[PDB]
Amino acid sequence: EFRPLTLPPKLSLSDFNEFIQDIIRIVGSENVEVISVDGSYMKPTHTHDPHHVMDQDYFLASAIVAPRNVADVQSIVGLANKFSFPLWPISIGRNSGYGGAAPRVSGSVVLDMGKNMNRVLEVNVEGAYCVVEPGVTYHDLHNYLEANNLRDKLWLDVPDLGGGSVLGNAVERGVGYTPYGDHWMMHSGMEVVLANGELLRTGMGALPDPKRPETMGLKPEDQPWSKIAHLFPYGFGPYIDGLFSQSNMGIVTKIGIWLMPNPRGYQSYLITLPKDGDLKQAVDIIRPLRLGMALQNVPTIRHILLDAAVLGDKRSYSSRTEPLSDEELDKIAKQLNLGRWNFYGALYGPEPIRRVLWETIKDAFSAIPGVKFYFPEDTPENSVLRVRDKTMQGIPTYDELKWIDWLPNGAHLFFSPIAKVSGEDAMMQYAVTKKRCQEAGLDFIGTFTVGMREMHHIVCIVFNKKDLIQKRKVQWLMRTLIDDCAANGWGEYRTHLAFMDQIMETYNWNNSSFLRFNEVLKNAVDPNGIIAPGKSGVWPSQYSHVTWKL
Amino acid sequence: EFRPLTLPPKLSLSDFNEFIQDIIRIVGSENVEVISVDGSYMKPTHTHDPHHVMDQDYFLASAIVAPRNVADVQSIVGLANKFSFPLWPISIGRNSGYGGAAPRVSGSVVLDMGKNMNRVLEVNVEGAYCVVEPGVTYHDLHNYLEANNLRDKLWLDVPDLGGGSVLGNAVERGVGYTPYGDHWMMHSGMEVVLANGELLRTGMGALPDPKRPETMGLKPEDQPWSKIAHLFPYGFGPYIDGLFSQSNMGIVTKIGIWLMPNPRGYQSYLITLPKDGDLKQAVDIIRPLRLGMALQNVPTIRHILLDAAVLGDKRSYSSRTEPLSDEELDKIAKQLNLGRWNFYGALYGPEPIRRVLWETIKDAFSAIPGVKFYFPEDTPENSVLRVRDKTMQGIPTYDELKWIDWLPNGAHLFFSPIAKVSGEDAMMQYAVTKKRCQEAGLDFIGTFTVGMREMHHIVCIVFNKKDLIQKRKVQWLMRTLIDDCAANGWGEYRTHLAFMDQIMETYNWNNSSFLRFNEVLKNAVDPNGIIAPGKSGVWPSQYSHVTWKL
Amino acid sequence: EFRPLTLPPKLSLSDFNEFIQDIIRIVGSENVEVISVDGSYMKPTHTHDPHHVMDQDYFLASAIVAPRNVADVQSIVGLANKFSFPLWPISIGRNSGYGGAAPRVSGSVVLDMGKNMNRVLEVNVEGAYCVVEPGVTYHDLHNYLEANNLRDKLWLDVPDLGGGSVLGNAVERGVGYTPYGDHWMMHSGMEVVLANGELLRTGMGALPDPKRPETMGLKPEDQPWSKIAHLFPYGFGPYIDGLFSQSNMGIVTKIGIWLMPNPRGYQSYLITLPKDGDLKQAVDIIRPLRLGMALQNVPTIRHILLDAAVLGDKRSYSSRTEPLSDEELDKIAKQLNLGRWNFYGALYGPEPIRRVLWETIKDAFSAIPGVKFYFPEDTPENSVLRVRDKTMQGIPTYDELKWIDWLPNGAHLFFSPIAKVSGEDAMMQYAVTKKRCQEAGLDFIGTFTVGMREMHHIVCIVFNKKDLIQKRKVQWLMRTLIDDCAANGWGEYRTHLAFMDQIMETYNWNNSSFLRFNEVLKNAVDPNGIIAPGKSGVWPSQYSHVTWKL
């Protein structure tokens, strides 16, 4: 194809067209779309940010390219190094809230790995693991287990939604709710295409499977893996796998992600916290039970607007452009039979043990007045515990999407600071953030996910993607929240295309020692800067901080 | 000081002497000893391998240098880059079995970080963590907790011996026995001196603590850390902390290692497996209970000679140069009231729960004939369960050292392959190894440590460091075992100075993609090759594979 | 000399000693002092900061070297480029409040240009200018005019104190009180030794004086200048003279600074502003009279503590460690017959014109209640108007030093933000700063100097250089004030050795475009980084931001 709306840096039109042609020849006309509107969580867009904060085509691809297999990826990379064309690799592109399929650098080629590279490569029962390609979404993994009847032996671990890529999420260091929630910490042996085009397999993935007739002559991409590949992440020597998470270090072709065997028992529940101020004691409560294991999976403490929101649009709670007052929340909270702050968790294993865990949990939370316990049964058909019920057992849903719906053309943007598991610290953070959401004229909506000795505070910024004034308040809110929290000793864990530089600038101990070490490693392996420049604020030297940052 | 026995590559004598003098001026005459015999686990040697396989001075330092604080380290590194002098950083030097304090490259300066850099920087109770300097050994950490009465709130996690460095062990990706056994996976935020001399703090360690009077003007080495430093290892962006384990990437000045709160209950035990062949069913038994959590800490399956050995010298079991026969083992096993294979584990938490866990464990192992359960009580004063009892609760010992004593001038050397948690695979591996120990004329002695979906097979090679013929059989055994296991799809997790190249050559999938990626990263950050060249077989380009490997 | 306390980067001791010897041979043993306490405004120290905020020897010289003439400077620079020794050029070293004689980089050689290079090169009456060497202080210039009877034709322009260098002050873009106060804007044609060692003369200084017998064969340093050198700063082409102010671009050997002819009339005065809040209207008052010229020189608006302070130690006003309250100020103000805010100015020229100017000024200030006008006559012998009287006519003093005396071992540190000439903006700034001085436990003391369309807010931080706790509060105050003002759209005009990086980081529009442009220019001309690295936060590339900034 002929003439894009946007060309990558320094590339002439003829060069775009030459590269472009070589590629049609590699992948098929069908595997490429040059770009001369947003879409659906259901039929996601690859060209840009659908939940866009900046201008719609602000971050935009020059062309979309679908590798049919690992070889193509090696081919595109060779060509990208020839022309100095930057690549923006995505698995599924559902990173909405963080940018979606959009590239940090506009005019880049978007590589949707997931279209043709969809395979469940293996589900190992004794080893209790699966091996996967980017196109493998969570629902897909589920359906794979169902139709192969694996449901009874092994459980999945899902984030709030069903359409994400098991792989991409893991690279982002994503999170889910079972005891296997730390996604990234669950991986073992992965394969990546380096910037040079060469294939690499990490850990025990480097120890080659022994030779045999059946396996002779297969392309490396195609070789089976050694016995320990997916059971011990370390392998031998420097443990380099992390340079692959939230980095521009390579293209991930496959990965092993550990699976939880059916636990022999499961009980999910809700505990409503009546007062806004209760977040305080609840957190001090959650603290020792988490370190101690009465608390198993990653439990979550939700704010009322989030459940109110899965339930209905702002408009069906109040016709007020303004943010709802603290009294209107208490009202909604009551109508819903929920609290100010809502706690979801789940029990795992023999009833005899669940029994004892629950007696302990139920007892600790009791120091909180007006506290109330429920089981899915004990609640309505449209309840959130009902949904999260499936969620805490590895079963995929999409009901949570309706929360994005609070506003007319709602779009989400995530502020994702981390806080200690201290009522005090959590209260402090909620304050700082809440206040600012206010000055911006927005309802504060959020949830803290309970790590073992840390918490992920996911502030859900919802806004009308069609309101310039607002969209502008959102960029002001963000950058401000970012500075305020850092001022308080807290930094974000993951972020959107537009705040990467800002957030990385936050991580400045000792004159930016961290970005600098990072820069040195990226230039070594990506001398031509072709793979995702700017990601996490890491820039190839070919990219000017003056021209590039934001 | 004047004239070493061995000079690093290409350095003239005058240069040695100049560098050497600059350094006395930096650290004090007292912090340095130029080298113009082996010693004790109790008073370890810094100059070379005490448990030496090769010739005694085979791997040897030119001088020993003790930095008084992080600044010195920055100073020595600047000087080392001036003269191109290689550094060999050690915390405590107890890596006997792997080389001890000895440097891969002889003539290097040995840096004992641990002498002056001994401090417990912090023990955080709410956060359930400690922050440490290299000189901090395990006993020391223990005594620190005792004398500050912290014993009742938090538990340590120790490897078999008490003298190691909490830090150094962790970098090596060492292992211990409580539920917090994966040492490395327990760290959060560490500080390292890069090859360039610049300071770096990982993860949330990069998010700087906010400013305040009390903290103004302190050297960076000296600044407190942000609130989340030690509670969430990830921070933001590429997770680079692993380039710091078993690598030549930097000098570790400090590290945060997570602590287990007193569990409210603990019960340790032993289960004797009568037949040599029982390893098979036991492993298939251990398998689902480990994935499921009836098995908590890292349990261990020991071979009889190991307990026989903590108990007494080969000489007090039999005067036979030859290896003891399979019948003599069954005899020793009986005299000791132990099995062929011995299983140690421990229970944690409320009796009500331990109760249920133990009923399940006790019941599974019963399909094994002649099986027998014991509690420390149920056994003698000199028993191993008695020792491991302290061990599985974080309490430090040294009784296990006597096993090194099997032979007259016993020295240990570790073959450390990894095997699946399959009776079949474990049996296969034990075979291959056992056979070879035989052809070498040596008693096979070993233990498998139970990971969750993998096992660490620690083969304990004991030999007389004073017997040339033998020492030679040992090098033959090793290199052979190394090739045989790889041929079987298994590779080692950690190794001695002398087998690093060999072992790394094993990890060759796709034309050595792994060592090559590694090499590229090291040259970038260590353009002058000054930090530990050759470690894990990773060589700076200034170092010739032809001249350097083994 | 033998062995310094501190060596510059990467220099060996022998190298220090070699360089050092070459230099004794160039300048005389007498012109050099190697350093193997603070001193006096009267006998200033060249080795470090006397008014030190950080640790005393924090910023410190390796050796002090006194060039006897421009050739030596060319010689030292050649040697400094040989060894890569950094130079820290000072004229007189009275930059106390900003660091004094101390070098940004410790171990640098301090060059006191002023000792041997003291000459008044010319005082041109028709052209109304003087030409000078660094050692030429203000008193000296005065005495030069007196003893050559030039007092009646031309007037000097002095800052608050008499000991500064006319030259050094100008480079710093210093300020004084007559109509010729913008020191830097008063210069024409200067001479500098480039980093390469070559001599340069700016503007019309490049147009060579025509040839003649009398002038034949003189060294260039020694050649007279063309007729227009000191009368039109521009010359022809790029006007590069500014790369010489507050920069590391070169060593200034001489400079032409324009002189004000005796005006034919002079009247100085004071106007007391009764209320703290009066700063507001007064500034709105000063505004149009300044743009219009009823206001001539640079008038100053002082805070009461400053006059109180020239008058007496905190101790003789109150024994209170705490800061004096707003009521105690009103008291002091009354005892002194002064206001809350005090305004000093001076009239110039024919009485007939002064007459009209004064009627206008006197009339505008009258909208302020309790306002009062005075002439030196109308006030006491120890008054500040009495001192500033000489000051506003170019006559040098030192009475103002006593203000440094507020505290026991008082030391000053200047926060020097700039504010609009708006009551509103000035009030806002005073607020922000005042508040912080409070949280630090310090009396706020300051003065705004009236530029024509801007004001220099000189906040005078006085502290006890011998109090660690305090010294620490001072560093906290500073860095905080720095961030707060920038947050308010205001940045500092000049600063201390310790806040240069911080302040430059403030000037970040468009990804730091400014420091970057600057860096590019410095490396070009100072490829070896030998001249003042770090000044104004500008670092040679040989200097690591990670190792260097603060």
Ligand SMILES: *Cc1cc2c(cc1C)nc1c(=O)[nH]c(=O)nc-1n2C[C@H](O)[C@H](O)[C@H](O)COP(=O)(O)OP(=O)(O)OC[C@H]1O[C@@H](n2cnc3c(N)ncnc32)[C@H](O)[C@@H]1O
């Ligand atoms: C809107 C929303 C989002 C959301 C959520 C709830 C709602 C209402 N709940 C989340 C949760 O509970 N946990 C979580 O981790 N994320 C949550 N999200 C955000 C988002 O939906 C998920 O993170 C989602 O799984 C991510 O989108 P997807 O999985 O489709 O990933 P992607 O768009 O392909 O992007 C991945 C990013 O990582 C890098 N990447 C991706 N693929 C590769 C390959 N092959 N190689 C190298 N890097 C890769 C890129 O940086 C890409 O941008």
Ligand SMILES: *Cc1cc2c(cc1C)nc1c(=O)[nH]c(=O)nc-1n2C[C@H](O)[C@H](O)[C@H](O)COP(=O)(O)OP(=O)(O)OC[C@H]1O[C@@H](n2cnc3c(N)ncnc32)[C@H](O)[C@@H]1O
């Ligand atoms: C003889 C023996 C050994 C042993 C054991 C039982 C016996 C009888 N049981 C072990 C166990 O249960 N678990 C385990 O991990 N190791 C076991 N060992 C082996 C050994 O004793 C321990 O691993 C011991 O803790 C290690 O010795 P030490 O802790 O003193 O470490 P070191 O000699 O200082 O060496 C550490 C190596 O790692 C790198 N290193 C060390 N310090 C630094 C710093 N500051 N910066 C960067 N790298 C560092 C070096 O490569 C050094 O060689």
Ligand SMILES: *Cc1cc2c(cc1C)nc1c(=O)[nH]c(=O)nc-1n2C[C@H](O)[C@H](O)[C@H](O)COP(=O)(O)OP(=O)(O)OC[C@H]1O[C@@H](n2cnc3c(N)ncnc32)[C@H](O)[C@@H]1O
């Ligand atoms: C304590 C104090 C200070 C003060 C003041 C009142 C008090 C109580 N009032 C001031 C005023 O009204 N106006 C003003 O400009 N400054 C005021 N100060 C501060 C200080 O005393 C003066 O600025 C003083 O004139 C500066 O000290 P000095 O004149 O001795 O300068 P120096 O120490 O030599 O430093 C000059 C700096 O500029 C660069 N420099 C100096 N010489 C050279 C040469 N030859 N070549 C290149 N650069 C040069 C250096 O950066 C040096 O640090």
Ligand SMILES: [Cl-]
């Ligand atoms: Cl999701």
Ligand SMILES: [Cl-]
């Ligand atoms: Cl040990």
Ligand SMILES: [Cl-]
């Ligand atoms: Cl002055």
